[PDB]
């Protein structure tokens, strides 16, 4: 024996290098859309067996990302949107074949991320008809790593919400939180996928955000904000990113309630209470670190997230009644005001959210 | 790339030439042509080049295929689908690319039907194409081929509809037809008076699209119901369209006649739907009046608006074709009175100045496909029109309709062909035979019944026509090649006179010849050559061989034709045609006698070679090498059959010397032998004394000094030509030396012994009628002696005949031989004891009715031979062979002869069955007796009583032969041997109690001298080979080389076990033979491998032949006989070698080149080891030969010490040393482990 | 279970679409030598006597895709010597499997398009292995690419000093004397072999061909007076190229006193009828309108051939 199948992994990357030399061809990729059609030749042929086979490109290897790499080669240049439609027949066929690979025995996990790479690369309606295909074909009874690919389905819809009026966000407003009640759940990356599902909750706007959220999800997210530090671990940058995504996601109702204030909110102050203390669980802990120069950026990230939390500190107090607390979070609010007056002096930053938080924490 | 209007169009030609060279470069042009198609998609200008680039579109129409890259095609196909999507530039294309786009969409959809697997995307492109095609249907300007390719795609959509199982609904093209089903009515009814004329003309074809679809599909029950909805609601729309045709009849009389012709084409469309079953001509007969409303001119000229709408509608010829469509719609409508009167209204027009001939084709289909009159009188009503058509100077105009008239008959036995063939070919020899060449080809389809009795003018027309087909010479190849399908419907008698007329035409071809007709006559010979399956045609092929003799003669295009005629003879050769080469060679020898007659020129040095070169050509055309003598056996007999005035005598005196060492006295012995000198004379009066003078010119005739037995063999050769023609000549043949008529009968018994030599003549060759003559000779034998004494061997000679072919005439002749058995054994039927077994033997393979009557002749003999003792009784076992006919009742009469003529009885019956079981006279008789023994064993519960304490022998002997004759098998006898043992008990061994090797021990003593009984070895072995029968000639001629190996008197005559084989040896005791040449061609180390590396069938025998090639320096006495065996064993059986192989190594290792005893040893080891069937069979030989050496050394070493001539015996003891030294090269485990590998094991 | 050939077509489909994109052909050895591990170095083990990727499964035919990669980007010397020590490793030793017939053709066709591309010498040692690994009872496609095999090698086997030409003086039309070919493409295999016969001057033709496989070609040609139709659009041009063989016989038999034809007046018989049909090859209708290439077959390729009809009447006259 000269070498094992790692030489084939050295060949599949070299086949991805053949895909990369194909990606090193040129600009606009009608020929690679035809190769996506040549992929669609294979992609129609997979479920044509419908018996004990798989999508052979995904069944070739695991790390070989030619489904993304040819789509990366298909991201050559926009000519025009049928390249963003030609692999749609390659998309839903192997997706129904992955749906024909239901219960995910040993090869159906990696399909949805290839579909997500297909979702992220180019779909004019090649995602929207795929969303019209997935409306007829979707099963969400997921598991540990399958929670991530379900958020990869959530990664598609906001990416599909891009074009001119988002063109299917009202159709995505049908695809609502009716299956999204599976939090208090799997691990930190899945919690980052839940933060990605919260990034999907930082999406699906006033067509459905005034319906789906109702401030009982953010309290369930306030339980998740408790869970992200407690139900797992090793989320040092991950829960920091999950807070930083929640810093976007809690601020995703900024112009929403400041348009006509519908917002469906029942418990409008519970989630803002424990999370702002959970900010001080990291940011006053970073104000316990209290460094001036950033480490490289992980100090600069959470501090900008604290500068984002500075807006969040200005957020709830500007509308809702602050200091109407019962627990020792008001005693932590003074510690948050200790984190404030530290970081307010340490800001050298935007004076609007500085002086407002100087009247919010005080 | 640098593509001007002048550059790219000029570049297209060499590109087309590159396409004309081949396809499949390294895919670069697939990049270029798709760019060029995109450049064609870019093309809307360069108007001269736009058509000049369409010259490449001819090549693009040429290069459509299914032999290109599935990527590079289908990529451009969807790119063509995009080009066909916004095909407005194609929809506004000028002329030719607009035509070629329809070729390209054809080139799409035809090549789309090939397999490249982009499944629904093509169907997405199809819906992309059809929506563009419905837009092309919407954008109707001129064409129909663009619609026809769409209709080809709609037929492909119909192929997409009716592919597996779908009921012709949700078809988007049928929905586009449903979209056409309102758009046509939109173009018909409302708001349509501006431009929808050609749109209706599209809607005509669009209605004709789904109509032709409904005519196309292999349809079914209510799955096909919506395929009948392609027209059903559209029929009301056609009723609207017929009303719209009445709205179209409200024309402004300005050039709408083509649209009216398109309306007529629209009218013909629903007529074409009505032309097939089904759906209600009661609707369509109304439109038939609207079809009649086109012209309606000569009888009516009814209204003025019904006049001018008919005058311009009459132009120019398609209206007469619309009248021919008005024939066809009336041919669909089954309104025969409305048909024939409109056909009479067509007969009212009937001239049209060109257009009646097109109008007369379906008019000849009008009264015919209906068959509205008498089907013989219907020919004449067409022939009266064909009389006008022959008067019309129908230069392919009605001649095509006359070509259409041939299969249009469809009800005529013979005589209608006899009248109508006068009209066709008489015009064809005048002019316009190009269309008649199709009509003559149409006759080969039309001839399913014709020319019963009065064919003597019919084929005389065709033989004149095929001769006239050489006047254009392209139909010369056509004419009888069509009759090669058609002249199977023929006997030989009048065809011979027709062939004599063809020979008269061939003589006219020989007369009217410069070089052109002879080439056509060569093809006419070739068309006669493929006209086989008749002996007179084989005689005409012999006349074509006489024409091949003429093709040997004229030698300009004739020698050019000759081998092609020999290839045509090879095309006539569905076998090796030595059969027809029997008598017809003498015809070519008569042509050679004519070439001997064409030897008046003083070419005694040249024509002695040139006639031999003429003799070389046809023999080389007969494709042989040694036929210089084998064909000469009849050719000298043909030279004997030559009168040989002066021209043949010195020719034969030189050609036989050119043949062999056969001078005019030496070949006079070869003229005396054979006696076909006297036999094939058979022309009594004039030539015989001249031939005897020619024999005096050959041998100084002392004609009393001749071989009477060869004359008795000639008497067999005489009685071939039965009988009086022989019997008159037999007397002069008898009175030559001493004999007379019906005399001598004891010499006739020697001629009956020569009838066994005639059976020996019946053994090797067949010439099957000689056996019929032998039965006539047997009838002459009853006329000779009525000799039952002969009937010992004669019936045995008749037995040896009986399955020479199982030709059913011999079954009649065996019945005649049974009648001869009813003749010669009339007083006794003594031999009919054992001839009943022969009657059981003969009627075993009978499967014939008169054989049952010949069995009824034995049942006649059950009275007539006075049914008697065990001749009548003991034959009852095998007698029950079939019981199919009332042979069973004769078998019931034989069951009477088994019971009415008739435990321990069973122990006798088993003992009767015992000798029956080990009889095995017939294998089926043994199989019947075993089948008799099965139910005989079903008489058990007494056999177990015969299974008491120790099991009472002859139950043993019953069991003993039940194993002993189950030694191997016959095929059913294998499974018959199952009920032998297993029906009885195990018979534990309880009473299973108890000289083959004494010969085999003396076989090494026979290996010693190779003189004492190697005779009894080799000759009797070749006697088993003597029934190779015959296949090949060398397999026969081995025995004559074995007769050349024959020597060694009376002890071999004492070895006459089959004394008929000794008589076959005595038959072979005259004929010289053995011209099979050989060499070494050594490759000895390869031969050490090709002991097994050659392909193992007789390769060890070929290694033995190479050992025979090595067997030079060994004891030359029978080394030539071994070399005579080397002639044999090269063709002979694997077994035939085996009786030589020991003695070979006994011969070779006396002394041969001690370093090449290694080569002998090299055969041994390499055959064993690297291989391990054909190996293992070859191994056992290698065993066996070594085992001889041992015993042969034992025969030596006995006589080495039983001596007290010991000098060379000490050298033979030194040989006995060296042979034992040769045994010390093998030993023995080497051999033994291979034996463990072998068939196995004990050795 | 239903993605055998269509999914296998996507490799060259990816390869040719990027080949039909952009600039210079150093990608011909860039991705290929990357992908060269996937079959040939994947067959490099040679477990005696079976390679690791070849003799396990039938999908070891990416050499045809490597031939398609050889057909991908055509400049100017790249992938061949890049596969040179790979083929001297793999294809030199893993080609004498002595049956090989699943893409034994495409194994040689990989070397054929290699020899078609450019070069002189590295394949010129490989033709000795094709001179070594040969057969007379090969498959109908294995005989077919074999006719193409020496054909692509013939350009450097007639480079200047012909460099491989006398190596097959016994492996000449002896190999074309593997007669009884198949249907008309295998008839056209001889026509390509006739097209391959244009080089190699006529000193010792009697040991190499003796015009005897050409007589077996004449045996096809004697049939060809009426053997074909509408593939006669190929076959009559193949007959027109068979007319060059008599002109080739005119440059050999009527070169200096041979006449070359003993038992072949029978062969030249219908050839003379084909010589009668030579100028009469395009004489069925003969109209004055021609789209691109119609009437030039029995006019321009009969201009030399009516001379070659008279030069079929030169060693043995009319």
From Swiss-Prot, chain A:
Region listing for Disordered, in residue ranges: 1-57
Membrane-spanning ranges: none
Subcellular location: Nucleus
Bridged cysteine pairs (disulfide): none
Region (Interaction with CINP): 118-156
Coiled-coil stretches noted in the UniProt entry, renumbered to this chain: 108-217
UniProt feature, compositional bias: Low complexity: 36-54
Expression by tissue: Ubiquitous.
Post-translational modification: Phosphorylated by ATR.
Pro residues composition-biased segments: 15-27
Functional description taken from the UniProt entry: Required for checkpoint signaling after DNA damage. Required for ATR expression, possibly by stabilizing the protein.
Subunit structure: Interacts with ATR. Heterodimer with ATR. The heterodimer binds the RPA complex and is then recruited to single-stranded DNA. Interacts with CEP164 (via N-terminus). Interacts with CINP.
UniProt comment concerning the protein's domains: The EEXXXDDL motif is required for the interaction with catalytic subunit PRKDC and its recruitment to sites of DNA damage.
Family according to the record: Belongs to the ATRIP family.
Official protein name in the record: ATR-interacting protein
Species of the source: Homo sapiens
Phylogenetic lineage: Eukaryota, Metazoa, Chordata, Craniata, Vertebrata
Gene for this chain: ATRIP
Swiss-Prot record, chain B:
Region of interest (Disordered), ranges: 252-284
Impact reported for residue 1100 to P: In a lung squamous cell carcinoma sample; somatic mutation
Expression across tissues: Ubiquitous, with highest expression in testis.
Post-translational modification: Phosphorylated.
Compartments (UniProt record): Nucleus; Chromosome; Nucleus envelope
Swiss-Prot/TrEMBL HEAT repeat ranges: 633-669
Pathology noted in the entry: Seckel syndrome 1: A rare autosomal recessive disorder characterized by proportionate dwarfism of prenatal onset associated with low birth weight, growth retardation, severe microcephaly with a bird-headed like appearance, and intellectual disability.
Quaternary structure annotation from Swiss-Prot or TrEMBL: Forms a heterodimer with ATRIP, forming the ATR-ATRIP complex. Present in a complex containing ATRIP and RPA-coated single-stranded DNA. Binds to DNA, and to UV-damaged DNA with higher affinity. Interacts with MSH2 and HDAC2. Present in a complex containing CHD4 and HDAC2. Interacts with EEF1E1, the interaction is enhanced by UV irradiation. Interacts with CLSPN and CEP164. Interacts with TELO2 and TTI1. Interacts with BCR-ABL after genotoxic stress. Interacts with UHRF2; this interaction promotes ATR activation.
Function: Serine/threonine protein kinase which activates checkpoint signaling upon genotoxic stresses such as ionizing radiation (IR), ultraviolet light (UV), or DNA replication stalling, thereby acting as a DNA damage sensor. Recognizes the substrate consensus sequence [ST]-Q. Phosphorylates BRCA1, CHEK1, MCM2, RAD17, RBBP8, RPA2, SMC1 and p53/TP53, which collectively inhibit DNA replication and mitosis and promote DNA repair, recombination and apoptosis. Phosphorylates 'Ser-139' of histone variant H2AX at sites of DNA damage, thereby regulating DNA damage response mechanism.
Family named by the database record: Belongs to the PI3/PI4-kinase family. ATM subfamily.
Protein name: Serine/threonine-protein kinase ATR
Lineage of the species this protein comes from: Eukaryota, Metazoa, Chordata, Craniata, Vertebrata
Gene: ATR
Portion held of the full protein: 167 to 1653 of 2644
